[PDB]
Amino acid sequence: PVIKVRENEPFDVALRRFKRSCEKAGVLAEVRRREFYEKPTTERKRAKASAVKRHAKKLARENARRTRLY
Amino acid sequence: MRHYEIVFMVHPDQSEQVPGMIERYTAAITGAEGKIHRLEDWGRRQLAYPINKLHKAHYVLMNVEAPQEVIDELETTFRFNDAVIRSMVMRTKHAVTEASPMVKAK
Amino acid sequence: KFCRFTAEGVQEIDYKDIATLKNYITESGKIVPSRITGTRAKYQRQLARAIKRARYLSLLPYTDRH
Amino acid sequence: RKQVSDGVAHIHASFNNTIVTITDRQGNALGWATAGGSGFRGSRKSTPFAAQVAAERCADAVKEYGIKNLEVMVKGPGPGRESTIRALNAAGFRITNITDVTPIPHNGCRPPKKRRV
RNA sequence: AUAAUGAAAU
RNA sequence: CUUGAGUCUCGUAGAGGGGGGUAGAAUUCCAGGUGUAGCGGUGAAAUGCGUAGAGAUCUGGAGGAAUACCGGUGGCGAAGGCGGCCCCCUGGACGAAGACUGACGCUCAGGUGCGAAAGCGUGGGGAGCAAACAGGAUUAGAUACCCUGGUAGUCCACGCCGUAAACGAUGUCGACUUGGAGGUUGUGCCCUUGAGGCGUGGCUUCCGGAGCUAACGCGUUAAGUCGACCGCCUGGGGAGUAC
């Protein structure tokens, strides 16, 4: 995330550009997840749980639009 | 015999020996019933990150067909020479004779 | 999803082609996921191989701060 | 002293403290201030207000060198990334650049074990 | 933040 | 005799196995420059480090462990398991069109091999973190959970041990029996509208019909309908213990 202040450019715009670039790069997430060690079992379990939850939510929301609430 | 692609890089302040190097290696390959399919000399280029406090390396590319003992000896020469700072040897499926993207838009 | 390599019928991705390889890395030097660019799996794998070869030969960077 | 007119501000922002150090363009230090040494202790040491106060004090402690232009480098995840930059702009310098240099390993060493409390 | 225990029957 | 089982010819995808080189990010330590009172840690603290100049910032060097992004209900392996890049040696699977042998097959008591982590023997290596151990704290006590330190081990070569919720808690082989939506890897044809349709193989995820089941549920990758061979059970404790 490298930001160069352009001519005539105010300071708030540059600051917001900095924040947006860092959000796109995603450094805070990496730093937070590398703080403690995680076992391979826990890693695999988290991945599977996320996939199952996402699939089920998609199915439920796609099948919930065939009923009338009132 | 198999088909190989070779790339090597040279110190910027020793660019006056590259033609002699090319001649010597080509002679070594051709003396053992080998062939040379493509040869290219790219000149000096800016590096993407420094190597040993340097930028601006000199690049050479070759595409050949030869036995394995010759390639082994060539690698040994690269290892023990001090003008060469990096090198790569790869295997190919067929001979390559077309032109590279570096001799079409440089 | 649209794939340029499949559309043009390519055999290899040519680690020497910096112009093509530039379209698949971010401003930090990271490889871009396939679900954003719409490539196929075969060609995504070939592409990662090519980018790593270029990184070693020093035609591409590893990170934006060296 | 010797005038400089061009400097770099380094911000070190952890989950427990903030450190600000102003330097010339070759890495030679001129002054520093920290959040824990500005009247704050414990829970109040890790808040954006403390980081702001530290930025003000660091700006003051280098007024004899006559600095005009400043680059900014930020390193760390803690609270204090933005308050410091705002305070430096307010103090009256001109910001020319902003860079992030937080270090990330390409799979090196084993971290400590998870806390169970 | 931590933070214990309750005879057997009807 | 050729339909089960095999051999030959052309290709394709893959973290399948063994050996040797090499690259970039980051941690720790060692020697220098600038600079001056705090750093580190917790729910709150203090043991610890610091004017004998720490922490912060810049430059040079040493060492050994792991490979961000790609990366996914993705791939390969009999299971255990396998992930940076390049070279050498090597095992299996699958598809198209032909040729060849002629039941050469399935299962398997005793037998023999392979087999995560921890542990054991001899010789090396040791950033990071970590049983045992020492000191802050918390508490009625705290041989704990939290904090500051820390060695066996974790790494390499050769040899032992033979066990795990070693799990799909579901032995191996063959045949038959309505459907829908996806993933990955081969191959044939074309109305011709050169960018799209129509077919045919191997592996794999989710839902669900008849039937089955004590129920939960399984459902062409069966726990449905059948055939061939093997292993195992017979109330709870004592006990997978004693001799």
Tally of domains in chain D: 1
Alpha helices in chain B (DSSP H): 18-30, 68-80
Give the torsion through C-alpha atoms of C53, C54, C56, C61, to 10 deg: -140
| Residue B88 contacts C where some CB pair is shorter than 8 Å | yes
What is the distance in angstroms measured between the alpha-carbon CA of C6 and the sugar C1' of F198? 21
Assess if residue A70 is contained within a domain.
Answer: no
Assess if residue B36 is contained within a domain.
Answer: yes
Query: Could you tell me how far CA D38 lies from the centroid of its own chain?
Result: 14
The answer to whether the CB of B100 falls within 8 A of the CB of C16 is yes
Query: Could you tell me how far CA B91 lies from the centroid of its own chain?
Result: 14
The answer to whether chain B touches chain D by having 3 or more C-beta pairs less than 8 angstroms apart is no
The answer to whether the CB of B38 falls within 8 A of the CB of B63 is yes
Residue located via tokens 């990271």: C30
Distance CA D87, CA D40 (A): 18
Partners of residue A2 in chain C, C-beta under 8 Å: 64-65
Residue of C nearest to B57 (CA): C58
Distance CA B15, CA B18 (A): 6
- Backbone φ, ψ for residue A67 (5° rounding): -135, 155
The answer to whether chain A touches chain C by having 3 or more C-beta pairs less than 8 angstroms apart is yes
Angle, to 10 degrees, between the axis of helix D48-60 and the axis of helix D81-91?
40
| Residue B49 contacts C where some CB pair is shorter than 8 Å | yes
Tell me the residue type at D114. K
Using alpha carbons, select from B104, B8, B56, A24 the residue that is nearest to residue C20.
Answer: B104
Chain A contact partners (≥3 CB pairs within 8 A): C, D
- Resolution (in Å) of the shown entry? 2.1
| Residue B105 contacts C where some CB pair is shorter than 8 Å | yes
- Domain of B59? 2-92
* Domain definitions of chain C by residue range: 1-66
> D110 and A4 in contact by Cβ < 8 A?
no
Identify any residues that bridge with D34 across adjacent strands, giving them in sequence order.
D19
| Residue C64 contacts A where some CB pair is shorter than 8 Å | yes
Name the nt closest to D19 by C-alpha to C1'.
F56
Using alpha carbons, select from C9, C20, C12, C6 the residue that is nearest to residue C60.
Answer: C20
> Which residues have CB under 8 Å from B40's CB, separation 6+?
B60, B61, B62, B100, B102, B103
Residue located via tokens 């749980």: A49
Assess if residue B104 is contained within a domain.
Answer: no
Determine which of B5, B45, B46, B49 to mutate to test the interface with C (most C C-beta atoms within 10 Å): B49
What is the distance in angstroms measured between the alpha-carbon CA of D36 and the sugar C1' of F5? 82
Query: Could you tell me how far CA D93 lies from the centroid of its own chain?
Result: 15
Tally of domains in chain B: 1
Sheet holding B84-92, edge to edge: B35-45, B57-66, B2-10, B84-92
> A34 and D110 in contact by Cβ < 8 A?
no
| Residue A60 contacts D where some CB pair is shorter than 8 Å | no
- Domain of A51? 1-56
* Cα-based distances in Å from B2 to B5, B67, C55, D11: 10, 7, 26, 57
- Domain of D116? 2-117
